[PDB]
Every structure is written in C-alpha cells, then in structure tokens.
C-alpha cells in the first residue's frame, strides 16, 4: 500500500494541549475518519506562542457492582 514513519515533534505535542478546544482529543480519539482542522490549531498555536491520576481497579469494581446491569 504505502509504508511510512511518524515520530511527532515536541511542537505538535504541546500544540494539541494549547489548542484543546479546537482539536477536541476526546472527540477526535473515537473519530479517526473525520478530518481534523489542521489549519486552525497551527494558526492558534503560533499566534498564542508565549505561555493524570487514573483511579484504581478497586474503585471501579466497587462502582460496577454499585451501579449494576
């Protein structure tokens, strides 16, 4: 088909964090076949240049039995 490489640069890494509202990683993670606005975050990241705990498995099993099927 077409082999390729991707090591994401550290400018793109924090560009996602700075432009969280435009990117929407929570939305984009489950929508791989929606084209992301690649122009908008690149404009806002350059324009706005100058500037987690997981909760254990004991808690989620306790939640699952507390809120059952």
């Amino acid at each position: 088909r077409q082999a390729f490489y991707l090591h994401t640069t550290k400018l793109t890494r924090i560009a996602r964090r700075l432009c969280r509202e435009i990117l929407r990683p929570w939305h984009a993670a489950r929508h791989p076949y929606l084209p992301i606005n690649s122009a908008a975050i690149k404009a806002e990241c350059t324009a706005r240049l100058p500037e987690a705990v997981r909760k254990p498995l004991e808690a989620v099993l306790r939640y699952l039995e507390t809120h059952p099927r």
């Binding site: 490489y5 991707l6 090591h7 996602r16």
Partner: protein, 381 residues
C-alpha cells in the same frame, strides 16, 4: 465490492493526515504474507549511544501455495519548530529470523520461562515447538520442528510451572501437554478436558494460580477449569457468557479475580471469578465480531480489543459511568478511550509492548503491520 474498497481507501487517507494529532508513533510496514499472529518478545537491547532501542516480534505467515515461515522481526522504537514529523520507515522494521513451518501459522506464542522457545498452532490438531537459536536464520528455498505435540486458535504457556501448554483441539476439547523432561521428538497429551459442546476457540492460563485456567467456545460458554480436580469431563464453573460464539479471553494482570471475554455478539464482557453469575460490564461499540482482547501490561484499568471490523478499540474502564456532554454521547460511551483506524481489513491479532507503555503492534489480512502509540494528551487528561 468496488464501491466499498474505494470508501475504505479514502478513509485511510483521512486517518493518515490525522496521525500527528491522534498519535505519537506510527510505523506501517507491508509484510510479504499476512500474519495471523503477533507478540512482543520480553527482551530489549539499548544500543550504545543511539536515540532508539531494538524490540522484537513473533510473526507468522498465512499461505496456501508457497512455504510458510515462523518470523521474528526487529523494531526501532525512539527514546526520549515544525509540524507533523513524517519520515519514511527504512531499516527500522526488518526480518531477523525466518524458520520453515509446516502449514500456515494460525497462532505463535513464546514460553515465559525461556523466550527462545516458541510454540505454534496449526490448522491440524498438533502444535509444533521451535527454538530459533537451534535453527539457522537463513532458510533454504523442509520443516524441522524441535517437538511435535499430538492431540480454534487457542494457545497458552503457563507463567508458573515451566513446560505446561494448553490449546483448543479440533474435537471440542482442550489438550494439555508437559514438555519438561522429555526423554524423543514426539510428545502426547497429559490431559484432555472435555466440557464444551461446540468448537473451542481460545484457552488461557491464570497468571497467579498454577492450577487455574479458563476457556471459551462456540457453545456460548466461559468454563473456568482446575487441573488438580480428577473430573476432567466437567469444569469448576460454567457461565452462559454471551448470546453468540465466544472467540477469546484474557485475565487482568493486576487482579487475580478479573478477566474479559470477547464474542461474535459484538461485545467484550467483563467478569469476576468471585461471582460468575453476575456480568460486571459489557463493552458495546464494535461494529462486528470480536476475535482478540488484551489487557495493558502497565495500566490495570486499560484493555484493547479487535476482530472482523478493521478498527481496534482501546477501553479505559476507569471512565465507566462518567458525565459526558450530549455531543460526546454520539461518539460512544466514556469507557471507550481510543479507536485505531489504521488498518483497512480484518485485524487478526495484536499485542501490547511490555517495555514501552502505550505502544501496540497490530496485524491484519491486508498484508500490513502497524506498530503505533496513541497521543500522549488522550490518555493523560
């Protein structure tokens, strides 16, 4: 269909352009033949004065006419003002060892105690064992297995008790071999467990308990077995797990009680060994059958799954029952963390990288292998 394949090819281009925003690592590589198996070997070499490290895989081939091979391939994973760091993979993914295999490799797994030893499932009842140090890395253009073990895709080495191997036989039974201290090339079964009524699909040892092992089959059941019990015709427990054929299972590495099972009813079911009557959770979202499911080695609340659909979903069960917006409800449930749309065909198998967190290798029926890591900002906040 000529229309559908065109719609797949466009969606691959959409995905490919999104990869800097959805991933930190993507490494596509077209194999000569499509692999039905994939597993990371536990070792990692850190070469002197470089910005990468050599991890290794255990791949196979699925071919009718040409000679099949047990493959081992190296992979270069990087160590720790321009956008989109695209390059070109060349000399990063390469084949180290090729060994001749009799028939197609439906599954291949390394022995936890001695990673040099690899068992391989066949379409027939038997399981062939190979030691890749014993064989030459350059095969001539004749299979030569170290042990043949007579008796679905199920295969599992026991992490405790070296040399104990399980597999799903062709006659609705689960074989059990003991290859430690063989006096003789051929080996026969120690035990044959006859519980299931239909074709057994997958079988897995329990991680902390030498005697415990689970199994799944086309008869819609999850059977938790005990090798110490004399009655081989009936298991310790038996659940009606799903509404269709159950194709896979996997125990949680951070909890002795928890496990997951995938099935042809488009759902991964979460279970607890302390109560097999209650089903803890049913992960709904997948658009076709589930054939594989794996827990993350690093994170207890993370598991991934794949199957007949070209997408591989990653589940974060720490987000179960979180307050979403109504826009996020359309996307899916909150426990669904990430969807991987890199493949354009049925994902046969995948495997989490044991050394580097969040790196997964997946293979598919369109000849391609993808080593990838999802974006840092998705899993961390």
């Amino acid at each position: 269909d000529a229309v559908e394949e065109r719609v797949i090819n466009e969606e691959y281009k959409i995905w490919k352009k999104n990869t800097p925003f959805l991933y930190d690592l993507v490494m596509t590589h077209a194999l000569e033949w499509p692999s039905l198996t994939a597993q990371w070997l536990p070792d990692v070499t850190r070469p002197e004065g470089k910005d990468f490290s050599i991890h290794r895989l255990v791949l196979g081939t699925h071919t009718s006419d040409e000679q099949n091979h047990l493959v081992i391939a190296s992979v270069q994973l990087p160590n720790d003002g321009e956008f989109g760091g695209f390059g070109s993979v060349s000399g990063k993914i390469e084949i180290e060892i090729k060994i001749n295999h009799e028939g197609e490799v439906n599954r291949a797994r390394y022995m936890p105690q001695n990673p040099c030893i690899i068992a391989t499932k066949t379409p027939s009842s038997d399981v062939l064992v190979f030691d890749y140090t014993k064989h030459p890395s350059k095969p001539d253009p004749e299979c030569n297995p170290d042990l043949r073990l007579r008796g679905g895709y199920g295969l599992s080495w026991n992490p405790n008790l070296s040399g104990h191997l399980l597999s799903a036989s062709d006659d609705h039974t689960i074989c059990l071999w003991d290859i430690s201290a063989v006096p003789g090339k051929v080996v026969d079964a120690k035990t044959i467990f006859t519980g299931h009524t239909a074709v057994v699909e997958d079988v897995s040892w329990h991680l902390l308990h030498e005697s415990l092992f689970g199994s799944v089959a086309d008869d819609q059941k999850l059977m938790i077995w005990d090798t110490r019990s004399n009655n081989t015709s009936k298991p310790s427990h038996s659940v009606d797990a799903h509404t269709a054929e159950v194709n896979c299972l996997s125990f949680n590495p951070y909890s002795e009680f928890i496990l997951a099972t995938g099935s042809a009813d488009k759902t991964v079911a979460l279970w607890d060994l302390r109560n097999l009557k209650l089903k803890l959770h049913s992960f709904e979202s997948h658009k076709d059958e589930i054939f594989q499911v794996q827990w993350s080695p690093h994170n207890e609340t993370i598991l991934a799954s794949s199957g007949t659909d070209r997408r591989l979903n990653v589940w974060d069960l720490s987000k179960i029952g979180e307050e979403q917006s109504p826009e996020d409800a359309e996307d899916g449930p909150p426990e669904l963390l990430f969807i991987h749309g890199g493949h354009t065909a049925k994902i046969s198998d995948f495997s989490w990288n044991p050394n580097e967190p969040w790196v997964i290798c997946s293979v598919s029926e369109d000849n391609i292998m993808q080593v990838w890591q999802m974006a840092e900002n998705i899993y961390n906040d």
